[PDB]
């Protein structure tokens, strides 16, 4: 069921601050941006 799995998943330096610019550099590389 949906709600139980959702609750369990929600039960488990932030994303937008650093990870947004880290993943883009790691995966989608371009010299105009990352050189």
């Amino acid at each position: 069921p949906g709600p139980w799995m959702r609750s369990l998943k929600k039960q488990l330096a932030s994303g937008p601050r650093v990870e947004f610019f880290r993943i883009l550099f790691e995966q989608f590389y371009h010299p105009n941006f990352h050189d």
Binding site: P16, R17, F20, L24, F28, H30, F33
Partner: protein, 62 residues
């Protein structure tokens, strides 16, 4: 123009308005006067709407 973007798509109010009232922010740990008007500081956070739009534009460019 604005008439074109309004024509394209505005929003989907499934849960109602998605934009809410603004919340002023104040510095906690330390101005040219002009104290006549208190400027809005709700956007100084990184988790705000303007930063999301900027990240969206950067992602589109990249």
């Amino acid at each position: 123009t604005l008439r074109w973007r309004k024509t394209l798509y505005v929003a989907s109010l499934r849960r109602g308005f998605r934009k809410k009232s603004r919340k002023q922010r104040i510095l906690v740990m330390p101005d040219g006067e002009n104290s006549l008007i208190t400027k809005p500081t709700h956007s100084y956070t990184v988790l705000g709407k303007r930063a999301s739009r900027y990240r969206h534009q950067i992602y589109k460019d990249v």
